[PDB]
Write a protein that binds this ligand. Sequence first.
Ligand SMILES: *[C@@H]1O[C@H](CO)[C@@H](O[C@@H]2O[C@H](CO)[C@@H](O)[C@H](O)[C@H]2NC(C)=O)[C@H](O)[C@H]1NC(C)=O
Ligand SMILES: *[C@@H]1O[C@H](CO)[C@@H](O[C@@H]2O[C@H](CO)[C@@H](O)[C@H](O)[C@H]2NC(C)=O)[C@H](O)[C@H]1NC(C)=O
Ligand SMILES: *[C@@H]1O[C@H](CO)[C@@H](O[C@@H]2O[C@H](CO)[C@@H](O)[C@H](O)[C@H]2NC(C)=O)[C@H](O)[C@H]1NC(C)=O
Ligand SMILES: *[C@@H]1O[C@H](CO)[C@@H](O)[C@H](O)[C@H]1NC(C)=O
Ligand SMILES: *[C@@H]1O[C@H](CO)[C@@H](O)[C@H](O)[C@H]1NC(C)=O
Ligand SMILES: *[C@@H]1O[C@H](CO)[C@@H](O)[C@H](O)[C@H]1NC(C)=O
Ligand SMILES: *[C@@H]1O[C@H](CO)[C@@H](O)[C@H](O)[C@H]1NC(C)=O
Ligand SMILES: *[C@@H]1O[C@H](CO)[C@@H](O)[C@H](O)[C@H]1NC(C)=O
Ligand SMILES: *[C@@H]1O[C@H](CO)[C@@H](O)[C@H](O)[C@H]1NC(C)=O
Lengths: 162, 421, 196
Amino acid sequence: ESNKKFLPFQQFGRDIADTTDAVRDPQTLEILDITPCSFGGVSVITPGTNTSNQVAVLYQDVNCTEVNVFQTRAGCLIGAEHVNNSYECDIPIGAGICASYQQSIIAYTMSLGAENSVAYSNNSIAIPTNFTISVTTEILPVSMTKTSVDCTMYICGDSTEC
Amino acid sequence: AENSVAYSNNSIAIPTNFTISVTTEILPVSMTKTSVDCTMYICGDSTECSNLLLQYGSFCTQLNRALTGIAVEQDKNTQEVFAQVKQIYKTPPIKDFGGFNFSQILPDPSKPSKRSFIEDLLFNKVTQKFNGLTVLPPLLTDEMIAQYTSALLAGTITSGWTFGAGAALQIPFAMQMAYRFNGIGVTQNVLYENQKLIANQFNSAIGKIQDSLSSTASALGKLQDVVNQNAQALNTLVKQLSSNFGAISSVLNDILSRLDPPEAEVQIDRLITGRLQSLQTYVTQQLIRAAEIRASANLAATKMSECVLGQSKRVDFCGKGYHLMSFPQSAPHGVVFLHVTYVPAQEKNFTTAPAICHDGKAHFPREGVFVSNGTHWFVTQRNFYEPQIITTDNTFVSGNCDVVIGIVNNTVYDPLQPELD
Amino acid sequence: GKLQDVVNQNAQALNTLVKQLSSNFGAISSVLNDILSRLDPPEAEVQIDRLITGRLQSLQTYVTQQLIRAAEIRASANLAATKMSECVLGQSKRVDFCGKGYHLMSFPQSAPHGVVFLHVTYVPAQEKNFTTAPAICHDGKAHFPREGVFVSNGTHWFVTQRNFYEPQIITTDNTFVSGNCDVVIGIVNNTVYDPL
Ligand SMILES: *[C@@H]1O[C@H](CO)[C@@H](O[C@@H]2O[C@H](CO)[C@@H](O)[C@H](O)[C@H]2NC(C)=O)[C@H](O)[C@H]1NC(C)=O
Ligand SMILES: *[C@@H]1O[C@H](CO)[C@@H](O[C@@H]2O[C@H](CO)[C@@H](O)[C@H](O)[C@H]2NC(C)=O)[C@H](O)[C@H]1NC(C)=O
Ligand SMILES: *[C@@H]1O[C@H](CO)[C@@H](O[C@@H]2O[C@H](CO)[C@@H](O)[C@H](O)[C@H]2NC(C)=O)[C@H](O)[C@H]1NC(C)=O
Ligand SMILES: *[C@@H]1O[C@H](CO)[C@@H](O)[C@H](O)[C@H]1NC(C)=O
Ligand SMILES: *[C@@H]1O[C@H](CO)[C@@H](O)[C@H](O)[C@H]1NC(C)=O
Ligand SMILES: *[C@@H]1O[C@H](CO)[C@@H](O)[C@H](O)[C@H]1NC(C)=O
Ligand SMILES: *[C@@H]1O[C@H](CO)[C@@H](O)[C@H](O)[C@H]1NC(C)=O
Ligand SMILES: *[C@@H]1O[C@H](CO)[C@@H](O)[C@H](O)[C@H]1NC(C)=O
Ligand SMILES: *[C@@H]1O[C@H](CO)[C@@H](O)[C@H](O)[C@H]1NC(C)=O
């Protein structure tokens, strides 16, 4: 049933790109609404075949009443149990939720790191007494492969009349 | 405005005061993550139209892989900028920083989504799945992005910037600014003898920030353009679903209902060819636009690791002036920096000389300028007027008084001689 | 992963290009040789042009991504050209530009279609709690440190550098006098040694 108020001289209704939202019943003269049954992508979360042959299917942005069940901001999970403790992210589900395999598949709001707060007073300082020299790597790409495709041969391919 | 510097040899201008300034800088970090399934535009839930689409190779597979590539990337743009601290520091519960306020930048003990008093304005001065359209949610919610910025703030205002080297080292904020005077060539004694004035000047600068943001028509225009281009490049894409492209009608369901298969395959193929070309064009433009923000999220990561996690000698990058420190503030789809700098003011001119001829030997300053008010010569640091009597302790002797041009004959006070007598 | 990924995309966008040669594009066959002879030229030219437009439009695509992906390499090939100059051929004070720590030096080493930097840094460790003071009032005059901190173990006051604990007795050659101990908030009384 359409709550939006209409006028009697004409029947169909639409907003953008020829998408008819409402329609007028011919016989009963009743105004209805049109919204399609929800679609959406499906994402499969796996911890790797070597570890185990288990998956946690996620349905992207569905109410989960029209498809361990769990409802997230990104969608709905099937196969992951919510856990109170927060771990570092392993598989990013989305909207601040991550999953991992460790009693099969868990789903937690990831923690941002080891929380700490050292003391601070207006007349105390901390000075290091020693040092550790460390070597860290860093990788940067510089070039690609220099392919060169001639346009004539690819399109035609040995055909004079082409 | 027209200027003409009163240039003349042996004449210099040295400032006698300073004015703390806080200037905001706004950078976009990421844009909206939209994923479009190529099959639902061209066909639109039609089995008899899908078969015609697979005749076009694997175009619909690239247009799904390309958009997914520039959607995972947006979760790396946010990671590079904010996620730069191993731990999550916290401010002490008793705030006594020697005069500096910081109550407009620190998290609010108030209504949830604990943003700063400034971040509330930034999240209010800027303010869908219908047909194949999607909007994936960002991995980092604004409730956790506001905690990276809090963690960075809760450590930069309390322990210097020893984060860029490893372990956090506590140090009172009253003696942080003394360090960063030495960076810009100003003796630390200027801070301590002017601490009360400096704290009030710094506090007033922050107070005018939210006034300069809320009252002004649009300071966040850099962040608004990104939204105004994504939402506009999508309307033009959606509105292209109502164009005939040379077919009998622009809606696919009304073609299959009044045409047999052998002659409907030619009317559909005009929509398929047109709509496919009407989707490759926008995907290409998103790839170019994503690279523009990618280069902007790499500059915002550099500013976080140089202006915020240290002091930068680079000119006119961490603010217009001599950089002191920066404070990062979150944004709907970006980040805002508050550069703190010194601008010299209230300058007075004097007469100089490159050397001082005493005892037949040239004298040069160690760190300072030989300056004379008209009768007596003094030595002052180049960024602040503080005259001192010329002494062998702040000058060094190297050369003879017959090579350099411009010497003035003057006596260099020796401190050992009168103590000896 | 950075170097290996670049190889895959080049070999993925090129394999996809090759597979585009076996698509009808709305024509009667995906093989051009079997359309030239099986059909008359008057009606072959309208079916061949379907393949020509399909293949040409499928060739303009991968050129664009190759053009776009090239800019992603030159952007990353200017960081290497900058890190090689500023960090290998010198010492950089830019924080976190060439490692996590205080930069000392780096060594460049080649890699297939890339470069690898071994950033040698200086990470402080084993900190120690201390009690400090901004200045010291001796004979009514303030004494700020020339370079270092006025640290105190609890009873005695020393001067040490800011990045390594190395305590030294406070003398007139370690501190410089300016003003009197009446404006500094937090000055601590102590005696300054005179080496003369
Ligand atoms: C400073 O740093 C090292 C830690 O890296 C301290 O421990 C020494 O480490 C080296 C190599 O492992 C050993 O050869 C020493 O025997 C260790 N010294 C110990 C355990 O006392 C080192 O003590 C620290 N201080 C000095 C002066 O080196
Ligand atoms: C600047 O140095 C000389 C020393 O006498 C003076 O020259 C004037 O400089 C100002 C700009 O600073 C110019 O606008 C004037 O045209 C200059 N000539 C004058 C006033 O006759 C001046 O006294 C010094 N400026 C100050 C504030 O002391
Ligand atoms: C700091 O802790 C103790 C307490 O002062 C120091 O022990 C004395 O330090 C002074 C000079 O540092 C010596 O002259 C004394 O002989 C020490 N003993 C007494 C009873 O005063 C200790 O040396 C200090 N630590 C450091 C590294 O200097
Ligand atoms: C249309 O036909 C049905 C069946 O009798 C009945 O509701 C009525 O005759 C008509 N409906 C109207 C006038 O609303
Ligand atoms: C799912 O449906 C229920 C009831 O209609 C509602 O409470 C909940 O907010 C919905 N979740 C969504 C729209 O994500
Ligand atoms: C998990 O957290 C909720 C509240 O945050 C609490 O009610 C519940 O008891 C907790 N369960 C476990 C196993 O910790
Ligand atoms: C320094 O003192 C504070 C006060 O509790 C403490 O938190 C900190 O651990 C101390 N540092 C060391 C190395 O013990
Ligand atoms: C800091 O700024 C706020 C805002 O006006 C003010 O209320 C407060 O008195 C100032 N000082 C402290 C210690 O909070
Ligand atoms: C530091 O704080 C204490 C009380 O919190 C105060 O008495 C003192 O004046 C401040 N300054 C110094 C150098 O102790």
